[PDB]
RNA sequence: GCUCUCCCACCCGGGGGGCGGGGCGGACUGUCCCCAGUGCGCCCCGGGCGGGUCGCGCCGUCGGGCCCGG
RNA sequence: CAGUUUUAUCCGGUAAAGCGAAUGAUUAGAGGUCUUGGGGCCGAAACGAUCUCAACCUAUUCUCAAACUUUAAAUGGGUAAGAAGCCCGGCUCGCUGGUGUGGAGCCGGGCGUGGAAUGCGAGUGCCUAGUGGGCCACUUUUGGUAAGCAGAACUGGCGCUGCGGGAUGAACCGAACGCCGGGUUAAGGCGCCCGAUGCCGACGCUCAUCAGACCCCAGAAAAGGUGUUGGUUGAUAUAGACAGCAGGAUGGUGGCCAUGGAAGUCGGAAUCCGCUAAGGAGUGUGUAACAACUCACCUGCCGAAUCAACUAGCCCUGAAAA
RNA sequence: GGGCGGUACACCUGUCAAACGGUAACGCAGGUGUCCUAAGGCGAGCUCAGGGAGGACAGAAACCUCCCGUGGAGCAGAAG
RNA sequence: GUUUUAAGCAGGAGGUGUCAGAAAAGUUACCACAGGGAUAACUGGCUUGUGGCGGCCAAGCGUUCAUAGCGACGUCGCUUUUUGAUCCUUCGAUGUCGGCUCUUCCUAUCAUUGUGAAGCAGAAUUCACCAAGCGUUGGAUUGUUCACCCACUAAUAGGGA
RNA sequence: GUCUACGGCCAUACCACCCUGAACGCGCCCGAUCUCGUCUGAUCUCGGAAGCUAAGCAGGGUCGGGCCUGGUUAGUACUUGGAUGGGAGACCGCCUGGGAAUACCGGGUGCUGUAGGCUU
RNA sequence: GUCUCCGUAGUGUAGGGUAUCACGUUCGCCUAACACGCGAAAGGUCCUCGGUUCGAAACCGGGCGGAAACACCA
């Protein structure tokens, strides 16, 4: 027999915490580190760039904040990727380097600097820190912030940190936590890295999987081999993205057809209902008490 | 012979309002403060760094200098007789607008709203504020009955 | 415009009720339901309350307009 | 410009209040399973059963707080109330920067119904005497049993200053001063000393063998009283009631077991209804007991009362100095 | 009153303080003349006291595991 | 003019706890001067806790019976003959303990005068009222105020100026 | 009506028990070659996609607690100024003006100022 | 004038998980009986109530009792 802990005088004492942080998608210790801007800049804004991983998209977003909520100027999904010729693994590190220069030339496309300000255009794996151009309008830059993920060694994040760099954008880093660092000796190479950027990890499956088994390879291949992708079609893309189809980035968002507005969610019930309800329980119960006994 | 220290008699005025601690929200710090705006003082037990002394909880004054994470103020004191015109560093925690001047900034556009308007009409439109006079003369209409009589009551002992 | 009580009807003049009554859609809960209670949307009719404003005629000033005007 | 007010605005944790809210202190019961024990208790054992005292849990209840608080006043503390402002062009920058972005500073032009109320001439700059032993009251307040004691906050006074009144008086109440005529008043006062009621003054309480008589102030109580004047609640009024010049109270029994002898007149669970305007095994005297008597409760003759309780007002006791 | 006895002789924390600030007495309850290469400076990662239900020797209290768990723990010392 | 040394300018350290910072143990009854009622020892003042005195309430004691006489736990007052508290007046001086002698005064009355109640039969004794005109002693020991003891007596009551 | 990053004091948004959830979505779920880590491939990291409605999820429900606002308590408590107003004193009345808080009884249970993809 | 110890079988008395000595005193051991010497008894509110504690008499006060102390300088 013991004292209930969850009493009035628990209720009364106990303030509640932020709404996202119940919600617990975020971190507020982190962002105020990351989101304010001196005072003495005058309403010059801090752009930031959000990078999401959900267990079957990547998202890459642009965003400064105000006080009525940080606002975007420029979002980049990875499941636009099939237009161009990537369908299957959607989410790897490829991808996630080839959404990364999907926003920074959409980037590009909408400022006006797309001849200017090239970035790479093969892709090797060394530092590139672009530097800015003297006379012409000057180069652009962005803060990342990936949020909740223990950027360790070896992220998928990075990749779109890679790629939306190659692309030209100028943002911050330095080689120590990309797929190729030795934690023992302390240097770096360019050629792992591309063995992780192009899909040959991935593709290692074309034996490990191809030979010692068979069956496995139909227990976990079953859409590579269902849109008809061998393990050597390991493939450029990356002049497609770069042509001409950031002149639709947004894809010209898709008119609306009408919709008969119907609804799908059961209204409230109401207070002259409440109060009757409870007219019917004690009329009830006292005409299933009387009669009986 | 009292103590002459830092914090002394601040028990209950740094404190945290109730239910309100935790922490700052962010709405606090990305407010836009230039010079010359008009600037009350709130202090806050938190962020310990860049506290004013305890007898400027409720000052209010102006701006002179802005940096990197504070501005400097402009504030008036009362030193055994004299007055003393004395300034400040304060971080930004410590620190609100005042809305006093805005019904005044927002009485110069209607004063001159009402004065670029109906000047050309050769209207003579009232511009100063007139206090509350003695209210008019006016009737009460008694439709029927007759006003209630009240009775004192009689005094009984209640407890 | 909003819509409580004299009173109105379901029910025993009153309480409960009221903004009532009529037609349609959908939703609702204890009870076997009938129930009836509610209740939103759409439409019509009845009923009083509440002043604004537009207006009317009539009564009401040892009134007001150089104490209007002939 | 202001020892002030109004209209907008932020700040504060005091008096009050509150424990069915935290931090601490605390009283009494109520339902439960034992959550555990010390003993009854049947028991070769128990949370089996136990009386439980008891703590334990839940809803309730009695009181509290300078170093405890959810709420939270009154007075009170800063700012703002237009030309030192607004609004249009444009320039420079080596800091800031995606973008002449972002700011700041500069040359120019345009706009006066003077932008709440009331009152008043203001601004700065030199040299410098005296002082640094302080006191009282209204409220607010800490130590102390208390002090014409010691110690702080707000305003005002004596000291530095007299004048009419308090019989007299450094501070209280009126009021602040050049020398003088006339008038009127303030706090106070008008039987005489002593200017003024030598009013047909108005309405009532009060008798002391210690009456009593005007802010600071010079003295006094708890409790008492059929001394009196008002008041309050119910219970007896042409319901002869409320005192008494009044007609009388025990045939069963002479109670039961009782005192040696007691019948009511002595002891005991008891205490009734039966012609009963009247039961009491007597309120009581008497007698060795009764006999003989009266009475609680009841029955005759006349023209308006009782019980407590406010100390409710004055008066008295309470109340002893050189 | 001096003396013997004390430190109100430099500092800080609550209270007296009369709701900004300031404010006294040999007025209260208390402490200091130091300690630390980490108990300083960054970063990742975890969440405490107490309480329940269980589990071999294990008991009032060793360790493990599950749930509730707004600070009831801790932050070198006095207290906020 | 050259080399050694010293003096120079700048920054830390060597400490003053009476902590805005002198280098410092006692006594005078053989004592001297400058001053103070801003500061003690007497009296007097305002106060009355302690001391002394008197009330109300009524559980019990009292062979029985609360209140003839007494009164528990509780509570309201006066007195300045005890000691304390304070520091207002006097330190260019108010002559400081006791006793002898000598007048007066108060009453909270020990005895005497006149009267009430008793657990008052008489004799004795305790209790209270009006009441201070009249009395209230002789001696041993101690510096004594205070105490203690022997006798007588009507009674050997208490104090102020 | 949902996903991403938010705003404000962050409760009208919390907690406890129930229930229905269309399509796109979010997630539990399938696994351990890839220098990601652990005593432990559960957590963290990566490569994935056969299979399905509990999920801080989303929406409604409780004569719910809790919270948010309104009446009562109350012109009560308190209080700035003043009086030769009582009272032995304690403290209480008056004029002048300001003026609260619980218990108790009612109503509400996320707006989304927000930008990008989306019941479309 | 009040602060410092400490109170415990009948006597006096040793000391966070039991109430202990020495003597007082009943029965039993060696002996030739005697003394000395020895072994088992009874004996406890560890001053009277409330809290710290899993368990306190030894920890905490409030309190009643006794004893031993102190008051200096006109
Ligand atoms: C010091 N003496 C005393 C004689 C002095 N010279 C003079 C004298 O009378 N002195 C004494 C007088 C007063 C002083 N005293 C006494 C009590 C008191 N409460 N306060 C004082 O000041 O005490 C002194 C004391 O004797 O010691 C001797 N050498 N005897
Ligand atoms: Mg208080
Ligand atoms: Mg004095
Ligand atoms: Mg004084
Ligand atoms: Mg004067
Ligand atoms: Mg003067
Ligand atoms: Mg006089
Ligand atoms: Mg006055
Ligand atoms: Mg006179
Ligand atoms: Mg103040
Ligand atoms: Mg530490
Ligand atoms: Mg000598
Ligand atoms: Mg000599
Ligand atoms: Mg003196
Ligand atoms: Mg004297
Ligand atoms: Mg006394
Ligand atoms: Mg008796
Ligand atoms: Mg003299
Ligand atoms: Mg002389
Ligand atoms: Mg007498
Ligand atoms: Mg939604
Ligand atoms: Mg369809
Ligand atoms: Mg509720």
């Known amino acids: 027999f013991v004292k209930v802990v969850k009493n009035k005088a628990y209720f009364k004492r106990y303030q509640v915490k932020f709404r996202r942080r119940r919600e617990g998608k975020t971190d507020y210790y982190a962002r105020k580190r990351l989101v304010i801007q001196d005072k003495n800049k005058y309403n010059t804004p801090k752009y930031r760039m959000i990078v999401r991983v959900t267990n079957r998209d990547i998202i890459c977003q642009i965003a400064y904040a105000r006080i009525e909520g940080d606002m975007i100027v420029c979002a980049a999904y990875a ?57 012409q309008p000057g180069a652009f830059t962005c803060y990342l912030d990936a949020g909740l993920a223990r950027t360790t060694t070896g992220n998928k994040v990075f990749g779109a940190l890679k790629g939306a760099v190659d692309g030209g954008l100028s943002i911050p880093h330095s080689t120590k936590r990309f797929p190729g660092y030795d934690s023992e000796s302390k240097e770096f190479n360019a050629e792992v890295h591309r063995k992780h950027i192009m899909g ?29 992708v061998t393990p050597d079609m390991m493939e450029e893309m990356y002049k497609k993205a770069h042509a001409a189809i950031r002149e639709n980035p947004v894809y010209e968002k898709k008119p609306k057809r009408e919709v008969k507005k119907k609804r799908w969610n059961r209204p409230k019930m109401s207070l002259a209902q409440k109060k009757d309800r409870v007219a019917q329980k004690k009329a009830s119960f006292l005409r299933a008490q009387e009669r009986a006994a | 012979t009292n103590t002459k220290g830092k914090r002394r008699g601040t028990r209950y005025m740094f404190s945290r309002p109730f239910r309100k601690h935790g922490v700052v929200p962010l709405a606090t710090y990305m407010r836009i403060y230039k010079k010359g705006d008009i600037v009350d003082i709130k202090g806050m037990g938190t962020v310990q760094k860049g506290m004013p002394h305890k ?37 930004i925690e410590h620190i609100k607008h005042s809305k006093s001047r805005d019904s005044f900034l927002k009485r110069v556009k209607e004063n ?43 005094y009984e002992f209640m407890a």
């Open chain 1, 79 to 135: 499941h636009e990727l099939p237009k161009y010729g990537v369908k299957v693994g959607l989410t790897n590190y490829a991808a996630a380097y080839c959404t990364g220069l999907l926003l920074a030339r959409r980037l590009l496309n909408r400022f006006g600097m797309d001849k200017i300000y090239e970035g790479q255009v093969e892709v090797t794996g060394d530092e590139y820190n672009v530097e800015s151009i003297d006379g």
């Open chain 1, 200 to 228: 040959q990890n991935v593709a290692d499956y074309m034996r490990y999987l191809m030979e010692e088994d068979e069956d496995a390879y139909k227990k976990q291949f079953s859409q590579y081999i269902k849109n008809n």
């Open chain 2, 55 to 91: 007898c400027y909880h409720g000052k209010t004054g102006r701006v002179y200098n802005v940096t990197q994470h504070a501005v400097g103020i402009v504030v008036n004191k009362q030193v055994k007789g004299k007055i003393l015109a004395k300034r400040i560093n304060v971080r």
């Open chain 2, 112 to 154: 001159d709203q009402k004065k670029k308007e109906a000047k050309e009409k050769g209207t003579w439109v009232q511009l100063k504020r007139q206090p509350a006079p003695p209210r008019e003369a006016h009737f009460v209409r008694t439709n029927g009955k007759e006003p209630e009589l009240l009775e004192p009551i009689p």
